[PDB]
Amino acid sequence: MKFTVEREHLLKPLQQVSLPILGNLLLQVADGTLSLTGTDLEMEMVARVALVQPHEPGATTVPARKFFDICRGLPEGAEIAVQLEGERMLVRSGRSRFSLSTLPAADFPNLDDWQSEVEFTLPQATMKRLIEATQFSMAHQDVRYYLNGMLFETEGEELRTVATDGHRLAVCSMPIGQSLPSHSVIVPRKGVIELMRMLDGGDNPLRVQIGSNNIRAHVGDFIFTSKLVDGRFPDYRRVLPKNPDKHLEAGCDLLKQAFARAAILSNEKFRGVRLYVSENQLKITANNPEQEEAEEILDVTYSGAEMEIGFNVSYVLDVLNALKCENVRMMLTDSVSSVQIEDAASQSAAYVVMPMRL
Amino acid sequence: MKFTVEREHLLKPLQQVSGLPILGNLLLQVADGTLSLTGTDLEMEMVARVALVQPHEPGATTVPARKFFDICRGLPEGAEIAVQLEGERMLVRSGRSRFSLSTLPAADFPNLDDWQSEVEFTLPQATMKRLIEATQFSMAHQDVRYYLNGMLFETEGEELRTVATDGHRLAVCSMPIGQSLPSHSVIVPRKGVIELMRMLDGGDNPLRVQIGSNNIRAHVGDFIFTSKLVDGRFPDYRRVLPKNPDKHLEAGCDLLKQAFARAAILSNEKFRGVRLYVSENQLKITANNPEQEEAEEILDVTYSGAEMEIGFNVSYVLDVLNALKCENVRMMLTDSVSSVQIEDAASQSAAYVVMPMR
Ligand SMILES: [Ca+2]
Ligand SMILES: [Ca+2]
Numbered sequence: 001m002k003f004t005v006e007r008e009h010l011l012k013p014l015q016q017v018s019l020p021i022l023g024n025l026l027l028q029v030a031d032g033t034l035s036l037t038g039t040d041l042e043m044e045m046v047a048r049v050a051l052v053q054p055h056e057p058g059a060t061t062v063p064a065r066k067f068f069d070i071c072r073g074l075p076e077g078a079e080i081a082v083q084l085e086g087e088r089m090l091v092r093s094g095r096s097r098f099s100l101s102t103l104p105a106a107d108f109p110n111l112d113d114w115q116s117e118v119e120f121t122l123p124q125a126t127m128k129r130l131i132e133a134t135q136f137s138m139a140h141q142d143v144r145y146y147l148n149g150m151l152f153e154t155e156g157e158e159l160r161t162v163a164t165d166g167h168r169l170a171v172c173s174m175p176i177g178q179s180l181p182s183h184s185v186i187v188p189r190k191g192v193i194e195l196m197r198m199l200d201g202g203d204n205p206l207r208v209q210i211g212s213n214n215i216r217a218h219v220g221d222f223i224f225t226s227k228l229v230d231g232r233f234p235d236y237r238r239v240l241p242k243n244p245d246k247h248l249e250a251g252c253d254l255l256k257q258a259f260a261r262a263a264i265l266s267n268e269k270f271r272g273v274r275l276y277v278s279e280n281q282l283k284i285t286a287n288n289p290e291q292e293e294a295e296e297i298l299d300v301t302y303s304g305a306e307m308e309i310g311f312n313v314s315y316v317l318d319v320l321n322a323l324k325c326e327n328v329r330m331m332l333t334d335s336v337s338s339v340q341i342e343d344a345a346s347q348s349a350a351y352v353v354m355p356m357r358l
Numbered sequence: 359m360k361f362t363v364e365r366e367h368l369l370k371p372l373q374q375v376s377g378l379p380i381l382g383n384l385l386l387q388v389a390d391g392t393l394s395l396t397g398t399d400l401e402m403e404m405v406a407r408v409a410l411v412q413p414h415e416p417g418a419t420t421v422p423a424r425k426f427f428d429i430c431r432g433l434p435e436g437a438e439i440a441v442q443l444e445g446e447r448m449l450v451r452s453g454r455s456r457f458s459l460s461t462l463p464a465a466d467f468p469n470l471d472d473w474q475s476e477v478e479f480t481l482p483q484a485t486m487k488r489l490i491e492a493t494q495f496s497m498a499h500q501d502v503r504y505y506l507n508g509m510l511f512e513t514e515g516e517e518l519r520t521v522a523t524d525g526h527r528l529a530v531c532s533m534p535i536g537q538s539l540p541s542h543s544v545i546v547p548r549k550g551v552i553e554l555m556r557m558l559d560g561g562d563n564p565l566r567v568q569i570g571s572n573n574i575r576a577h578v579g580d581f582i583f584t585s586k587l588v589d590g591r592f593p594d595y596r597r598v599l600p601k602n603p604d605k606h607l608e609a610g611c612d613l614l615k616q617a618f619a620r621a622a623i624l625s626n627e628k629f630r631g632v633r634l635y636v637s638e639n640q641l642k643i644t645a646n647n648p649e650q651e652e653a654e655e656i657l658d659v660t661y662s663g664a665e666m667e668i669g670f671n672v673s674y675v676l677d678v679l680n681a682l683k684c685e686n687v688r689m690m691l692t693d694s695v696s697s698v699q700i701e702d703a704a705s706q707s708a709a710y711v712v713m714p715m716r
């Protein structure tokens with residue numbers, strides 16, 4: 001196995017593809033192409049790079065981090081010559097020489113073979129929007145294992161993501177211009193993060209294939225495959241407040257800064273803040289067990305009945321930071337119901353926070 | 359106690375002083391048209407003075423430092439901040455943002471012992487920055503020899519000098535300050551060095567230093583920092599500089615750094631040993647690890663001395679090269695079992711000594 005490639009043509013693939021063999025990358029030279037594969041047994045990334053210089057076929061595995069670090073450590077645009085020599089992989093560029101340990105390509109694990117059952121193509125930016133809108137609301141390491149990921153749902157002509165930690169919920173729906181079967185799957189949280197970072201911000205379309213227990217995403221030279229979480233996800237429809245009758249609109253940043261200052265004097269563990277809404281005015285209060293107290297008053301747009309409501313300010317600040325927009329809509333019912341929060345200029349993403357009695 | 363100040367006048371002082379629960383509080387004192395703000399940990403103290411141009415009333419209190427800072431920082435650009443002591447709370451008002459903070463009595467706030475200045479001088483901020491940055495990385499970390507955990511500040515002739523060492527490597531930097539100084543040495547603890555550095559805003563305000571038998575004080579602008587000193591017998595750098603390191607090697611600093619950095623990837627993860635082979639206008643760096651992986655770097659250098667080999671902890675060498683912010687480095691060698699001296703090829707202001715490895 002032999003190949004010579006420019007440093008930069010390896011770095012992006014290396015970043016994407018990054019028991020001992022799990023710490024190695026599979027390298028394969030075949031039919032004019034170097035393939036690089038990383039895996040943790042749950043998910044796998046394959047990156048292809050065209051070989052324009054002379055090369056010789058073959059396959060091995062090499063320590064991922066050390067190989068990455070050597071390549072990154074070489075000078076910008078350096079030529080990197082790689083060949084197998086015995087049980088070692090030789091790396092040479094200029095007068096820099098490296099000899100790395102190998103493990104047999106035969107020992108590199110494959111994900112189980114599977115069949116694609118639902119497929120669609122969408123712009124990368126659309127998938128990025130869907131994931132970014134909801135990612136922060138996934139659970140991390142909850143005993144409810146099915147919350148440690150993101151629901152991907154197809155319905156009519158749209159793709160939807162849902163994330164919840166069992167306390168707050170995020171949902172985002174986007175039309176993708178293709179007739180889809182009604183379907184939903186759970187992508188493990190590590191898989192969501194890996195998928196997100198494979199999206200490079202460019203013009204390559206994204207092709208998604210979903211099987212019974214797997215998902216695959218293809219963008220340009222990269223192919224990501226993950227197991228799905230085998231479980232049942234909560235129904236977001238039952239979480240959204242039914243027909244909320246009271247709408248407040250305010251500048252996102254003004255609202256966020258008011259909440260952020262109030263949060264300083266909220267309970268450190270439970271983070272409860274109170275809202276008092278009246279004609280075109282919002283008052284936010286916070287207090288803590290040391291009996292310190294914050295109050296914020298700001299102009300908003302509101303004409304409904306006067307009401308009060310408490311919430312976890314961390315959850316609300318999470319929403320406002322995710323929204324990054326000009327204006328926000330808080331959809332209210334009463335002191336004993338959840339709130340729905342949206343970009344005032346878009347119904348694509350919605351966020352639900354539970355009420356607190358303070 | 360009442361004052362009204364522009365946010366912009368409070369922020370930097372609050373950051374500088376904020377950097378027994380009462381140790382979590384700032385002492386605020388309005389007296390003679392000045393607001394003073396003090397923070398302490400019993401070992402060191404920062405005091406900031408703020409001119410009060412708006413109406414004010416005298417008195418003193420203490421308030422939670424982080425909360426007060428976070429509230430002020432959280433307020434908008436150009437906010438006016440009105441503050442008044444009411445009963446046992448401190449009221450903070452700006453626009454329609456209101457905050458009530460807990461207090462502890464000013465009478466409870468601890469003072470450093472009184473002391474007399476024995477040695478005094480003035481120096482540009484840029485000189486103190488240079489002295490600290492040139493040596494700081496070489497201080498010990500939690501060594502049982504406590505004095506090695508800090509930094510020696512030495513006056514000799516008209517020079518101020520810093521020395522830092524952990525027994526394995528040493529840094530020394532000397533700078534002229536244009537004043538006849540006594541011969542004197544003190545050891546500033548780690549945290550004091552960090553603060554000394556933090557107080558240098560980079561402007562044209564000179565620094566005034568006062569040294570007592572057990573304290574150091576630095577005045578810059580409207581800030582006064584005071585630290586206790588560290589007792590103990592700090593090693594003499596003059597005994598550590600090789601007596602006659604007459605084998606001189608010169609090489610590009612970044613070229614040398616990046617070669618060591620690549621070689622380091624395949625060095626022992628705990629011991630970090632690399633080997634240097636010096637010969638006529640050539641340096642070869644090698645590294646190997648228990649897994650029998652190997653790196654080799656060959657660089658052109660300027661060297662006319664006799665051939666020799668020497669082993670080093672590569673992290674120590676990299677630390678030096680990263681601290682040398684320059685074009686060319688000089689390495690001054692003795693033999694395979696003696697320390698190396700390293701300097702900027704174009705300046706003798708700082709020197710670095712690294713012990714060899716067997
Ligand atoms: Ca280039
Ligand atoms: Ca629908």
Ligand SMILES: [Ca+2]
Pocket residue numbers: 153154155181182183184
């Ligand atoms: Ca569906």
Ligand SMILES: [Ca+2]
Pocket residue numbers: 203
């Ligand atoms: Ca294009």
Ligand SMILES: [Ca+2]
Pocket residue numbers: 293294295456457458
């Ligand atoms: Ca209040």
Ligand SMILES: [Ca+2]
Pocket residue numbers: 530531532706707708709
């Ligand atoms: Ca010197």
Ligand SMILES: [Ca+2]
Pocket residue numbers: 625626631632633644645646647
């Ligand atoms: Ca070695």
